[PDB]
Amino acid sequence: RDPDQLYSTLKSILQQVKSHQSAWPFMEPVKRTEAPGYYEVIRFPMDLKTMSERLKNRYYVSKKLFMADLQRVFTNCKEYNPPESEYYKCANILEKFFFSKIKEAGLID
Amino acid sequence: RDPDQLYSTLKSILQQVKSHQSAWPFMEPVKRTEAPGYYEVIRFPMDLKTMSERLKNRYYVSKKLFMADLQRVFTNCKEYNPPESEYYKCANILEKFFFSKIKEAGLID
Ligand SMILES: Cc1cc(=O)n(C)c2cc(NS(C)(=O)=O)ccc12
Ligand SMILES: Cc1cc(=O)n(C)c2cc(NS(C)(=O)=O)ccc12
């Protein structure tokens, strides 16, 4: 199906991103205990669990919307963290992986 | 000087980004001749010359608008190019630099 081909492709892509070694910082909403003041600085939090739910809730009706949420995961991380932190490093490694999977899927608007 | 402090800060930041060694791929619009199918995949092209113009035209009335344009330069490049390409490398080097200058200016809280 035309909306169900999108769903399948995104579910595949998201699952692969989630299984990647460098995804571990981004699997759930940042915990206050782990990052006090994070939620005062970061206005639009995002994480892969929230993305999983959004996907199951049929929110990702286009490539644009999926891309923006995943990209926000990376840009939040780069805004909050210093450039040579492990968190920043993971974000760029996983972003590379992300873009290779997007392209591998022939994913388009 | 409340809108003109913003202008000054942005002009400084943009100039520094433009003077950086790794900015050379992003100084003018991607040419169709030099990149096949680029404009089919990349929906919102952006570059530092267009940003210079937008700045000179008083388009950047907020930090948000400036951030989005410059971020898009990087994310366009990373979506389109393979991860070990010189273009992708430049993008991450210059993105690091960018986030350091933004933070240095107190332009993210
Ligand atoms: C400190 C910190 C920054 C950050 O950008 N992320 C994504 C984190 C993730 C963490 N893991 S978790 C269990 O809160 O999702 C812990 C600390 C950070
Ligand atoms: C193919 C290509 C990709 C890219 O991301 N950028 C920024 C380019 C820049 C180029 N230089 S220019 C002078 O056309 O803007 C040429 C090709 C590419």
Side-chain angles (χ1 to χ4, degrees), chain A residues 3-109, chain B residues 3-42 44-62 64-108:
Chain A
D4 252 354
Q5 178 157 351
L6 181 69
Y7 185 79
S8 298
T9 304
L10 295 187
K11 179 167 173 152
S12 165
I13 292 159
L14 187 54
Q15 285 188 332
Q16 292 184 244
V17 170
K18 284 162 86 209
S19 298
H20 199 276
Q21 289 173 11
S22 296
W24 64 268
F26 310 114
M27 295 293 289
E28 265 156 23
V30 173
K31 310 175 168 195
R32 283 174 293 200
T33 59
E34 309 253 307
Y38 179 95
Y39 288 105
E40 277 85 300
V41 185
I42 299 296
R43 302 183 55 105
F44 302 108
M46 189 45 58
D47 66 276
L48 301 169
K49 182 153 116 177
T50 300
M51 284 194 72
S52 293
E53 291 289 314
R54 282 182 172 205
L55 179 66
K56 321 204 315 170
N57 292 338
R58 299 307 198 127
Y59 174 72
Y60 297 122
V61 302
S62 76
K63 173 206 170 110
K64 307 169 185 146
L65 290 165
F66 184 84
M67 300 288 281
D69 277 2
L70 194 26
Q71 189 57 218
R72 177 70 56 187
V73 173
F74 304 138
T75 67
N76 286 347
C77 180
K78 295 179 196 177
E79 282 196 82
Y80 189 73
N81 299 282
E84 311 306 318
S85 72
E86 195 61 33
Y87 294 126
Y88 199 117
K89 285 175 194 153
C90 287
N92 271 340
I93 291 172
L94 191 63
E95 186 184 41
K96 277 192 195 178
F97 180 77
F98 162 66
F99 285 127
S100 75
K101 298 298 164 184
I102 291 289
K103 186 162 221 167
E104 176 180 299
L107 203 72
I108 53 167
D109 280 301
Chain B
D4 252 355
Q5 174 56 295
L6 181 68
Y7 186 79
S8 298
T9 304
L10 297 188
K11 179 166 173 153
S12 164
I13 291 159
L14 188 53
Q15 176 42 246
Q16 289 186 65
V17 170
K18 283 162 87 209
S19 301
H20 199 275
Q21 287 185 128
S22 296
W24 64 267
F26 312 111
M27 297 292 288
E28 71 173 314
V30 175
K31 310 177 166 88
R32 293 221 177 213
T33 59
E34 308 211 322
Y38 183 94
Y39 284 71
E40 279 90 332
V41 74
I42 302 297
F44 299 104
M46 188 45 57
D47 66 278
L48 301 170
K49 186 192 230 187
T50 300
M51 283 194 73
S52 293
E53 293 165 41
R54 282 182 172 200
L55 178 65
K56 181 57 153 166
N57 293 338
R58 300 307 196 128
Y59 174 74
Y60 297 124
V61 301
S62 76
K64 190 177 182 146
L65 289 164
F66 184 84
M67 297 287 286
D69 277 2
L70 191 29
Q71 190 65 74
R72 195 139 63 254
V73 172
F74 306 135
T75 65
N76 287 347
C77 180
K78 291 192 252 178
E79 152 148 48
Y80 189 72
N81 296 281
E84 310 306 317
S85 72
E86 196 179 37
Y87 296 130
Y88 199 114
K89 286 175 194 153
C90 288
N92 275 340
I93 290 172
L94 192 65
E95 187 187 52
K96 278 192 195 178
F97 181 79
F98 161 66
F99 283 120
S100 77
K101 295 298 165 182
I102 290 290
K103 289 181 218 170
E104 176 176 311
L107 210 80
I108 299 164

PDB file of all heavy atoms in Angstrom, chain B residues 76-95:
ATOM      1  N   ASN B  76      21.408  19.492   4.631  1.00  0.00           N
ATOM      2  CA  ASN B  76      21.319  19.256   3.184  1.00  0.00           C
ATOM      3  C   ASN B  76      22.559  18.500   2.680  1.00  0.00           C
ATOM      4  O   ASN B  76      22.472  17.456   2.018  1.00  0.00           O
ATOM      5  CB  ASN B  76      21.212  20.571   2.415  1.00  0.00           C
ATOM      6  CG  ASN B  76      19.859  21.258   2.554  1.00  0.00           C
ATOM      7  OD1 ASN B  76      18.882  20.682   3.023  1.00  0.00           O
ATOM      8  ND2 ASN B  76      19.810  22.514   2.126  1.00  0.00           N
ATOM      9  N   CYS B  77      23.710  19.023   3.032  1.00  0.00           N
ATOM     10  CA  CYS B  77      24.965  18.420   2.636  1.00  0.00           C
ATOM     11  C   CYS B  77      25.083  16.973   3.121  1.00  0.00           C
ATOM     12  O   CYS B  77      25.513  16.093   2.363  1.00  0.00           O
ATOM     13  CB  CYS B  77      26.114  19.256   3.195  1.00  0.00           C
ATOM     14  SG  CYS B  77      27.730  18.609   2.757  1.00  0.00           S
ATOM     15  N   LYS B  78      24.694  16.722   4.369  1.00  0.00           N
ATOM     16  CA  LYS B  78      24.844  15.403   4.932  1.00  0.00           C
ATOM     17  C   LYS B  78      23.866  14.413   4.358  1.00  0.00           C
ATOM     18  O   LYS B  78      24.221  13.219   4.244  1.00  0.00           O
ATOM     19  CB  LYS B  78      24.764  15.448   6.444  1.00  0.00           C
ATOM     20  CG  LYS B  78      25.971  16.126   7.015  1.00  0.00           C
ATOM     21  CD  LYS B  78      26.112  15.961   8.537  1.00  0.00           C
ATOM     22  CE  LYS B  78      25.802  17.241   9.248  1.00  0.00           C
ATOM     23  NZ  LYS B  78      25.874  17.098  10.713  1.00  0.00           N
ATOM     24  N   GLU B  79      22.653  14.879   4.010  1.00  0.00           N
ATOM     25  CA  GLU B  79      21.660  13.985   3.358  1.00  0.00           C
ATOM     26  C   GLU B  79      22.118  13.582   1.961  1.00  0.00           C
ATOM     27  O   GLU B  79      22.010  12.410   1.591  1.00  0.00           O
ATOM     28  CB  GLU B  79      20.211  14.570   3.326  1.00  0.00           C
ATOM     29  CG  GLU B  79      19.286  14.125   2.174  1.00  0.00           C
ATOM     30  CD  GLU B  79      17.813  14.071   2.615  1.00  0.00           C
ATOM     31  OE1 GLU B  79      17.384  15.072   3.235  1.00  0.00           O
ATOM     32  OE2 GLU B  79      17.097  13.045   2.362  1.00  0.00           O
ATOM     33  N   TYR B  80      22.619  14.559   1.197  1.00  0.00           N
ATOM     34  CA  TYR B  80      22.956  14.347  -0.202  1.00  0.00           C
ATOM     35  C   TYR B  80      24.253  13.577  -0.404  1.00  0.00           C
ATOM     36  O   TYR B  80      24.323  12.710  -1.241  1.00  0.00           O
ATOM     37  CB  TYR B  80      23.042  15.670  -0.926  1.00  0.00           C
ATOM     38  CG  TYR B  80      23.178  15.488  -2.411  1.00  0.00           C
ATOM     39  CD1 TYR B  80      22.084  15.053  -3.172  1.00  0.00           C
ATOM     40  CD2 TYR B  80      24.411  15.705  -3.069  1.00  0.00           C
ATOM     41  CE1 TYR B  80      22.212  14.835  -4.541  1.00  0.00           C
ATOM     42  CE2 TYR B  80      24.541  15.494  -4.433  1.00  0.00           C
ATOM     43  CZ  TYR B  80      23.440  15.065  -5.167  1.00  0.00           C
ATOM     44  OH  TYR B  80      23.554  14.906  -6.525  1.00  0.00           O
ATOM     45  N   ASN B  81      25.276  13.887   0.376  1.00  0.00           N
ATOM     46  CA  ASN B  81      26.606  13.312   0.145  1.00  0.00           C
ATOM     47  C   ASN B  81      26.942  12.053   0.979  1.00  0.00           C
ATOM     48  O   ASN B  81      26.472  11.915   2.116  1.00  0.00           O
ATOM     49  CB  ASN B  81      27.645  14.370   0.419  1.00  0.00           C
ATOM     50  CG  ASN B  81      27.540  15.540  -0.548  1.00  0.00           C
ATOM     51  OD1 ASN B  81      27.995  15.456  -1.676  1.00  0.00           O
ATOM     52  ND2 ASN B  81      26.959  16.631  -0.096  1.00  0.00           N
ATOM     53  N   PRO B  82      27.785  11.154   0.419  1.00  0.00           N
ATOM     54  CA  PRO B  82      28.233   9.989   1.197  1.00  0.00           C
ATOM     55  C   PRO B  82      29.126  10.409   2.372  1.00  0.00           C
ATOM     56  O   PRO B  82      29.780  11.460   2.301  1.00  0.00           O
ATOM     57  CB  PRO B  82      28.990   9.121   0.184  1.00  0.00           C
ATOM     58  CG  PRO B  82      29.262   9.984  -1.008  1.00  0.00           C
ATOM     59  CD  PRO B  82      28.327  11.162  -0.965  1.00  0.00           C
ATOM     60  N   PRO B  83      29.060   9.644   3.490  1.00  0.00           N
ATOM     61  CA  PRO B  83      29.532  10.084   4.804  1.00  0.00           C
ATOM     62  C   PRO B  83      31.035  10.353   4.899  1.00  0.00           C
ATOM     63  O   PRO B  83      31.464  11.173   5.729  1.00  0.00           O
ATOM     64  CB  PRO B  83      29.115   8.929   5.745  1.00  0.00           C
ATOM     65  CG  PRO B  83      28.859   7.753   4.865  1.00  0.00           C
ATOM     66  CD  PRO B  83      28.429   8.306   3.542  1.00  0.00           C
ATOM     67  N   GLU B  84      31.828   9.698   4.051  1.00  0.00           N
ATOM     68  CA  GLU B  84      33.269   9.930   4.049  1.00  0.00           C
ATOM     69  C   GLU B  84      33.704  10.854   2.930  1.00  0.00           C
ATOM     70  O   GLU B  84      34.896  10.996   2.698  1.00  0.00           O
ATOM     71  CB  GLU B  84      34.036   8.591   4.033  1.00  0.00           C
ATOM     72  CG  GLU B  84      33.567   7.577   5.102  1.00  0.00           C
ATOM     73  CD  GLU B  84      33.565   8.143   6.532  1.00  0.00           C
ATOM     74  OE1 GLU B  84      34.539   8.837   6.897  1.00  0.00           O
ATOM     75  OE2 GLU B  84      32.589   7.900   7.291  1.00  0.00           O
ATOM     76  N   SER B  85      32.751  11.520   2.275  1.00  0.00           N
ATOM     77  CA  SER B  85      33.081  12.543   1.298  1.00  0.00           C
ATOM     78  C   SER B  85      33.669  13.761   1.994  1.00  0.00           C
ATOM     79  O   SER B  85      33.342  14.050   3.142  1.00  0.00           O
ATOM     80  CB  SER B  85      31.859  12.979   0.474  1.00  0.00           C
ATOM     81  OG  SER B  85      30.980  13.740   1.264  1.00  0.00           O
ATOM     82  N   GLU B  86      34.524  14.465   1.270  1.00  0.00           N
ATOM     83  CA  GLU B  86      35.083  15.738   1.689  1.00  0.00           C
ATOM     84  C   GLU B  86      33.974  16.754   2.040  1.00  0.00           C
ATOM     85  O   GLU B  86      34.115  17.526   2.992  1.00  0.00           O
ATOM     86  CB  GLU B  86      35.948  16.295   0.529  1.00  0.00           C
ATOM     87  CG  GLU B  86      36.921  17.406   0.841  1.00  0.00           C
ATOM     88  CD  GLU B  86      37.708  17.823  -0.398  1.00  0.00           C
ATOM     89  OE1 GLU B  86      37.134  17.837  -1.535  1.00  0.00           O
ATOM     90  OE2 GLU B  86      38.917  18.081  -0.231  1.00  0.00           O
ATOM     91  N   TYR B  87      32.868  16.746   1.286  1.00  0.00           N
ATOM     92  CA  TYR B  87      31.749  17.666   1.575  1.00  0.00           C
ATOM     93  C   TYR B  87      31.128  17.374   2.932  1.00  0.00           C
ATOM     94  O   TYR B  87      30.866  18.306   3.691  1.00  0.00           O
ATOM     95  CB  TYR B  87      30.670  17.627   0.484  1.00  0.00           C
ATOM     96  CG  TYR B  87      31.145  18.114  -0.867  1.00  0.00           C
ATOM     97  CD1 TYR B  87      30.919  17.364  -2.014  1.00  0.00           C
ATOM     98  CD2 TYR B  87      31.802  19.320  -1.005  1.00  0.00           C
ATOM     99  CE1 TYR B  87      31.338  17.806  -3.259  1.00  0.00           C
ATOM    100  CE2 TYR B  87      32.223  19.773  -2.246  1.00  0.00           C
ATOM    101  CZ  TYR B  87      31.983  19.013  -3.363  1.00  0.00           C
ATOM    102  OH  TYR B  87      32.401  19.445  -4.585  1.00  0.00           O
ATOM    103  N   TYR B  88      30.875  16.089   3.216  1.00  0.00           N
ATOM    104  CA  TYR B  88      30.299  15.672   4.501  1.00  0.00           C
ATOM    105  C   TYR B  88      31.255  16.010   5.643  1.00  0.00           C
ATOM    106  O   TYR B  88      30.834  16.589   6.618  1.00  0.00           O
ATOM    107  CB  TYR B  88      29.962  14.174   4.489  1.00  0.00           C
ATOM    108  CG  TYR B  88      28.979  13.712   5.551  1.00  0.00           C
ATOM    109  CD1 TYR B  88      27.717  13.235   5.203  1.00  0.00           C
ATOM    110  CD2 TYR B  88      29.311  13.757   6.898  1.00  0.00           C
ATOM    111  CE1 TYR B  88      26.817  12.801   6.179  1.00  0.00           C
ATOM    112  CE2 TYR B  88      28.420  13.320   7.874  1.00  0.00           C
ATOM    113  CZ  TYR B  88      27.183  12.840   7.508  1.00  0.00           C
ATOM    114  OH  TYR B  88      26.326  12.436   8.485  1.00  0.00           O
ATOM    115  N   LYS B  89      32.544  15.735   5.468  1.00  0.00           N
ATOM    116  CA  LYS B  89      33.570  16.133   6.461  1.00  0.00           C
ATOM    117  C   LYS B  89      33.569  17.629   6.773  1.00  0.00           C
ATOM    118  O   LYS B  89      33.538  18.030   7.944  1.00  0.00           O
ATOM    119  CB  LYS B  89      34.968  15.747   5.986  1.00  0.00           C
ATOM    120  CG  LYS B  89      35.247  14.260   6.077  1.00  0.00           C
ATOM    121  CD  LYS B  89      36.602  13.925   5.464  1.00  0.00           C
ATOM    122  CE  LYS B  89      36.731  12.428   5.249  1.00  0.00           C
ATOM    123  NZ  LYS B  89      37.674  12.172   4.130  1.00  0.00           N
ATOM    124  N   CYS B  90      33.606  18.456   5.725  1.00  0.00           N
ATOM    125  CA  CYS B  90      33.554  19.917   5.893  1.00  0.00           C
ATOM    126  C   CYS B  90      32.321  20.337   6.696  1.00  0.00           C
ATOM    127  O   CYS B  90      32.420  21.177   7.591  1.00  0.00           O
ATOM    128  CB  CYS B  90      33.575  20.657   4.525  1.00  0.00           C
ATOM    129  SG  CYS B  90      35.185  20.610   3.700  1.00  0.00           S
ATOM    130  N   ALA B  91      31.176  19.742   6.375  1.00  0.00           N
ATOM    131  CA  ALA B  91      29.937  20.097   7.030  1.00  0.00           C
ATOM    132  C   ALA B  91      29.985  19.898   8.541  1.00  0.00           C
ATOM    133  O   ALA B  91      29.526  20.751   9.277  1.00  0.00           O
ATOM    134  CB  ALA B  91      28.794  19.298   6.475  1.00  0.00           C
ATOM    135  N   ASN B  92      30.562  18.784   8.988  1.00  0.00           N
ATOM    136  CA  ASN B  92      30.640  18.517  10.424  1.00  0.00           C
ATOM    137  C   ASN B  92      31.677  19.330  11.135  1.00  0.00           C
ATOM    138  O   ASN B  92      31.455  19.725  12.265  1.00  0.00           O
ATOM    139  CB  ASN B  92      30.860  17.043  10.706  1.00  0.00           C
ATOM    140  CG  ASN B  92      29.561  16.273  10.742  1.00  0.00           C
ATOM    141  OD1 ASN B  92      28.475  16.852  10.925  1.00  0.00           O
ATOM    142  ND2 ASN B  92      29.661  14.942  10.617  1.00  0.00           N
ATOM    143  N   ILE B  93      32.802  19.591  10.460  1.00  0.00           N
ATOM    144  CA  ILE B  93      33.828  20.481  10.992  1.00  0.00           C
ATOM    145  C   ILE B  93      33.225  21.862  11.190  1.00  0.00           C
ATOM    146  O   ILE B  93      33.331  22.443  12.252  1.00  0.00           O
ATOM    147  CB  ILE B  93      35.071  20.547  10.065  1.00  0.00           C
ATOM    148  CG1 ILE B  93      35.836  19.212  10.103  1.00  0.00           C
ATOM    149  CG2 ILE B  93      36.028  21.652  10.512  1.00  0.00           C
ATOM    150  CD1 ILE B  93      36.970  19.095   9.080  1.00  0.00           C
ATOM    151  N   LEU B  94      32.561  22.374  10.175  1.00  0.00           N
ATOM    152  CA  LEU B  94      32.014  23.749  10.208  1.00  0.00           C
ATOM    153  C   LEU B  94      30.777  23.879  11.109  1.00  0.00           C
ATOM    154  O   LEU B  94      30.560  24.918  11.711  1.00  0.00           O
ATOM    155  CB  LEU B  94      31.665  24.209   8.790  1.00  0.00           C
ATOM    156  CG  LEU B  94      31.354  25.702   8.606  1.00  0.00           C
ATOM    157  CD1 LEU B  94      32.586  26.543   8.906  1.00  0.00           C
ATOM    158  CD2 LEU B  94      30.840  25.980   7.197  1.00  0.00           C
ATOM    159  N   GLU B  95      29.997  22.822  11.203  1.00  0.00           N
ATOM    160  CA  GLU B  95      28.914  22.726  12.213  1.00  0.00           C
ATOM    161  C   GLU B  95      29.421  22.780  13.648  1.00  0.00           C
ATOM    162  O   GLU B  95      28.841  23.499  14.473  1.00  0.00           O
ATOM    163  CB  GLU B  95      28.137  21.440  12.031  1.00  0.00           C
ATOM    164  CG  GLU B  95      26.903  21.310  12.903  1.00  0.00           C
ATOM    165  CD  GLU B  95      26.276  19.930  12.794  1.00  0.00           C
ATOM    166  OE1 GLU B  95      27.014  18.943  12.966  1.00  0.00           O
ATOM    167  OE2 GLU B  95      25.070  19.824  12.467  1.00  0.00           O
TER     168      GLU B  95
END
